[PDB]
Amino acid sequence: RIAALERNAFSVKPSLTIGYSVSRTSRNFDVDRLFPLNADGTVANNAF
Amino acid sequence: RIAALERNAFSVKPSLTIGYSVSRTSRNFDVDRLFPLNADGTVANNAFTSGGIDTDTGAQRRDFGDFGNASDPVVAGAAGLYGFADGVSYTVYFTDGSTATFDGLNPADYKVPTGKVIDTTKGRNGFGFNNLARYKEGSTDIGIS
Amino acid sequence: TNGNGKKDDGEATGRGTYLGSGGTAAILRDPAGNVYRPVFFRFKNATTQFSVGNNPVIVTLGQQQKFYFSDYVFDNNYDGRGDGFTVTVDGSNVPVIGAWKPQIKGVYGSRSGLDGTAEAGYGVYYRGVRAQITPVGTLTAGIHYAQEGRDMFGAAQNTTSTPSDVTTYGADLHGKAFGVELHSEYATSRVRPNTANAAVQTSNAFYARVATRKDNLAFDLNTPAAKFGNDTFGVSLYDLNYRKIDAGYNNVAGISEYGYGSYSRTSAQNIAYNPDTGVTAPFANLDRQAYTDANNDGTSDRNADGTVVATNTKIGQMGFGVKAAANLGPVAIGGYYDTSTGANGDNANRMTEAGGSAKVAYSIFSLRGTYNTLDSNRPQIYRDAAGTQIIGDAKVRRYAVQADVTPGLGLFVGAYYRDVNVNGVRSTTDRGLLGRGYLASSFEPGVGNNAYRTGLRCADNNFGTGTRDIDGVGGVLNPAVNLDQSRTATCFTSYGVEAGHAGDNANALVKDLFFRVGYSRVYVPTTATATTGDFSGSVTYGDARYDRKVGVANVRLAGSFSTTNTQLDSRPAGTRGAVGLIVRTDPLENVPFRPQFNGQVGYYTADNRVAAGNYNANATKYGAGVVLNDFLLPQTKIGVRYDGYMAQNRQYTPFDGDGTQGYFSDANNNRRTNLNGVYVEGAYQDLIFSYGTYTLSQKDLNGVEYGSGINNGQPARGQTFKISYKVNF
Amino acid sequence: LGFDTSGQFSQVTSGTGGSLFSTAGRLQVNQIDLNFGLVTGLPSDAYVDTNGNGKKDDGEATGRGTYLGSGGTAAILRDPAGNVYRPVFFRFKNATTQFSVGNNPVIVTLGQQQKFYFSDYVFDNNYDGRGDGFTVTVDGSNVPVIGAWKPQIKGVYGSRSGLDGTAEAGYGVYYRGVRAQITPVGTLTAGIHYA
Ligand SMILES: [Ca+2]
Ligand SMILES: [Ca+2]
Ligand SMILES: [Ca+2]
Ligand SMILES: [Ca+2]
Ligand SMILES: [Ca+2]
Ligand SMILES: [Ca+2]
Ligand SMILES: [Ca+2]
Ligand SMILES: [Ca+2]
Ligand SMILES: [Ca+2]
């Protein structure tokens, strides 16, 4: 009986996000060209 | 505890359809009048019946065409091959951008309603023949509900 | 949007407001293949009543209350009236009066609940109460009071024809006591019109019967109400009634849903019982008809088809009737009488019918006599001698003598002699005038069954006058239609003889064989409107039917014949015949594969001697089909089907929107039809392939094809290929 | 928030059908790929496809612009006392279009964009497909006399691109073909075909 109930069941998965951010710039330019390059050829991760 | 859970449960019943169909016809006519009649008075089933049975209005499966994607009702008189096929009709081109449908065989028998005049330029003296061919292009349909 | 519960013109469709909820247009989707559809909550409540409490007192609160006080008073059990409540008090359990089963009902409500200012039920409320006891036997007596009127808001903004108030009360007595069934009812009404300072209109109804009633609430008139003696020496009474219905009594005066007019003006003209609208009143409010002249050209108006246009005025009804019988061993006799007029008693609306019968039946023989009479001074709609519909007086006199013999087995033979004399002159047909009454009765052939059943036996040993069919060859290929049991219901002036057979009887010479053959001579006057004449007409007809199972094949064949020199009903003169045959076989397990065959064939010819010009009509229909239940692959089967139809001077009239089905009929259109095709179907496992090609051609004489409709000389054509596959989760 | 069901709904079985005759049901089981579940909002990438081409042409309304309150920052469907309402949608995506019935020798496939390949220069359409139709394959590996040659016959029918407008190249265009094949000696495979 439990197996049949689980077959017709919905898995509720709520989500929640939280975070603060502020950013100012006189002109918009790129800074990903300053970060180190990994062995696979991708730049290092950063928050900006 | 299980009985309470089943009381507040939803039975999910998905559905799926699949099938291919192509149909061509020069003129739409009925073929349900050719099939054998069962002992209870109903014609034998077939895969080409676009028949709407309606006991309220007296409609039957032999009163509608079956060869296009449309269920064109048969028409009595010489216009519809004496009840054997869909009837001929014309469209009437009036002045000031209005049109009307004439459901006969001869366009020389149409009465012009008062307050309107036909535009001779469009069509054959304002009468445009309505084509009778019906086409259902070959395609397979998958329906999910 | 308007709340009426119907889809008016202009209201938006469901899929047009919620895009992506269905259809092919406006699919709400997402790149990477996602498709979104809104989720809806669907519900439907079929319950509107809520009964609280237990015996004795039960109270019901509902939304469209159905209730029924009596036949002529406050009967609203078909669709209901409106929003309110109903209380029922049952006093079966009580010390002193528990044996009489008292019962009290109470009703309150508002017509239709919320209504617009222009609707009849705006600010209109009803109320009522009914008492009841059952003193002796089934005999139930009761009294009731009813009321319906406008409130202070309804009386000022209703802008309709609803009366200011209606007050109705009465009594009834229904049941069976001391072996006698008795029904009666009295009712009085007072209607005050909506107009200013108008007089109160009083109208009352009354009737009193001695007859049996069914649970359907319709009177039987075939089972005696009061008997005496036994089957040897017995006298039974079937009906004895008196009625008086006022001219101003209708649904409004009775606070009912549907009025008390005649159900039909041609059959049972005095009876108001309407199964369609749920009216159970036994007697009607009669109509007097007259010619109509709207444009005032000096000539009475007629419809497009030649039918007269009549104007109806409401007269009451007041008369009496009787119907009895007497069994004296082998000899049985009967009789009836019935008269009616307007409520005022004037003789200018009198309709009187009377008649009798007789019967003697010893061993297999039989003999019957009959007499009938109609003296309708009341104007009635019927066709004249020439054939033009008229309105006026009518007098009919009919007498018939019928002999019978049943020499055993399924055999039967019967001769008859009938005579109809309308308006003082011999006539071919009675023009339906004898059907206006409701008490006409006749016996039935046989020994031991001396019941005096209602209805003239004008449809016994007659021929058939059918003209319409659905199979296309006259009904010989239709298993659901028995060609030998088709008999016309009109009363002719003829004498003939008929012999037949019935294979459904327990004793029969040949099982499952039905056939008949007859010969009658109809009376035709010298001219259309002459007085003298002779039996110039002549009819010879024969039918057959035989169902059998030989081996694995179920064989059925039928036939028919006819030849006349006069037109009868809607069937023209000239000969006519049709034959058919249907064969079906079970699968043959003894041969390779498992084939089961099918087949049918039909032929129909008719030489019509119509006045406009003699023409000939033909028909031919055939079929064949083989199904191989086990093909080469283990789970594969295939089937084929061939059909055809060749007609000549025949047509098909499509269905009428009123409720009448279509049919095939003869027509002098001078056109030959040829419709045929093939139908191939094969299945692998559960995958079905369907193919079919057909061709219809209709060319007139001298060979001018009309099939395509564009006058190119080509016939119509059609083709379809379909692959089907049904899956379940 | 999102509702996700289990994966038990990934298999279907056949049913009875036919007009001249009735077949036995539950003769085949077909594996399908359905991923469906309830969602409480629409992504910014959604749109309303009115012409049926499967692409977001210019002018077609966005998904969030037709169902207000289904996402984004503008047009929040709320209620004082803090309640916020979002419509509930049913999301699904089928990655299966073919349905193979039967077992060896004869296998029949019904699909929506049929991929097939006869030879290099003839009737090679195994990249994107042609249209709506069916394909039948007969394999004669097990047969008394010619079982060692591994015969095989293919059959193809279809309508190019299925439903098309009057201006598209696939309007009223149908194809058909058949191919035979044997492997007499070694790997050497000979065959003939028609298109
Ligand atoms: Ca049809
Ligand atoms: Ca409405
Ligand atoms: Ca009301
Ligand atoms: Ca209402
Ligand atoms: Ca009723
Ligand atoms: Ca006139
Ligand atoms: Ca698009
Ligand atoms: Ca396409
Ligand atoms: Ca195409």
Author numbering:
A (entry chain A): 245 to 292
B (entry chain C): 245 to 389
C (entry chain C): 439 to 1167
D (entry chain A): 390 to 584
Paper's wording?
We have solved the atomic structure of a highly abundant protein, SlpA, and discovered that it forms extended structures that link the outer membrane (OM) to the peptidoglycan (PG). Our structure shows that SlpA exhibits a tripartite organization, with its C-terminal part forming a homotrimeric 30-stranded OM β-barrel (OMBB), its central part forming a trimeric coiled coil that can traverse the large periplasmic space, and the extreme N-terminal part forming an SLH domain trimer that can interact with the PG layer. Our results indicate that SlpA cannot fully tile the OM and that it is not a fundamental component of the S-layer, but that it connects the OM to the PG layer by forming extended homotrimers. Deletion of slpA leads to substantial disruption of the D. radiodurans cell envelope, suggesting its important role in the maintenance of cell envelope integrity.
We performed single-particle analysis on this cryo-EM data to solve a global 3.3-Å resolution structure of SlpA, with the best resolution in the β-barrel of 2.9 Å at the core. The structure showed that SlpA forms a homotrimer of 30-antiparallel–stranded β-barrels (30 β-strands per SlpA monomer). The SlpA β-barrel is the first structurally characterized 30-stranded barrel and one of the largest single-chain β-barrels observed. The C-terminal OMBB of the D. radiodurans SlpA is preceded by a long, homotrimeric coiled-coil segment, which, in our cryo-EM map, is well resolved from residue 215 onwards. When compared to its homologs, the OMBB of D. radiodurans SlpA (residues 254 to 1167) contains several insertions positioned within the pore. Residues 272 to 377 form the most extensive, ordered insertion that lines the cavity of the pore. This insertion appears to be stabilized by a canonical bacterial SLP metal ion–binding site coordinated by residues D274, D276, and D310. Although density for metal ions is resolved in our cryo-EM map, the identity of the metal is unknown. The protein:protein interface of the SlpA β-barrel consists mainly of stacked β-sheets from apposing barrels. These sheets contain a hydrophobic patch made up of residues L260, I262, Y264, I386, I388, L390, and F392 stacking onto V401, F479, F481, F488, and L499 from the next subunit. The coiled coil consists of a highly conserved, prominent salt bridge between E232 and R227.
